[PDB]
Amino acid sequence: PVEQTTAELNWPQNGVWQSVDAPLIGYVATDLTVTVPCQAAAGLVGPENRNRSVLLSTVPKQAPKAIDRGLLIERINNDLTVIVRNTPVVSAPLEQVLSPDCRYLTFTAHADKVTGEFVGLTQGPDDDDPGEAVRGERSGYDFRP
Length: 145
Hints:
Layout: E1 32-37, H1 42-45, E2 54-57, E3 71-76, E4 79-84, E5 87-93, H2 94-98, E6 104-109, E7 113-122, E8 133-139
Antiparallel strand pairs: 1-6, 2-3, 3-4, 4-5, 6-7, 7-8
């Protein structure tokens, strides 16, 4: 056996809602878990007039190979979408994100499968089997941002 020193990056340790640098040598983290209250989305949705694009991202948004390497929980058009690598995990219109007041977004990154979900929300007549949770999961590729 050998004595390891386990490390974990946490976001409530800032106290104030703000960005923090943590560049990883081995590009991806063993596992991540993102939990965000849906009512927090107001800071970028609520204005309409403002330019605050990303809720949180594991890559600075304006880097050209960003929407290709990492995770971005952001407002795109009239929707709040979750994009990991180049594929979009989940998608919910900004109205349904805040207006029902019974929602929150969760997301996890694992080597076997990457998953996100708009908990408490159900999507109508479309790709999502109507009534089933606004979820999205992708496997058969290491999608870790």
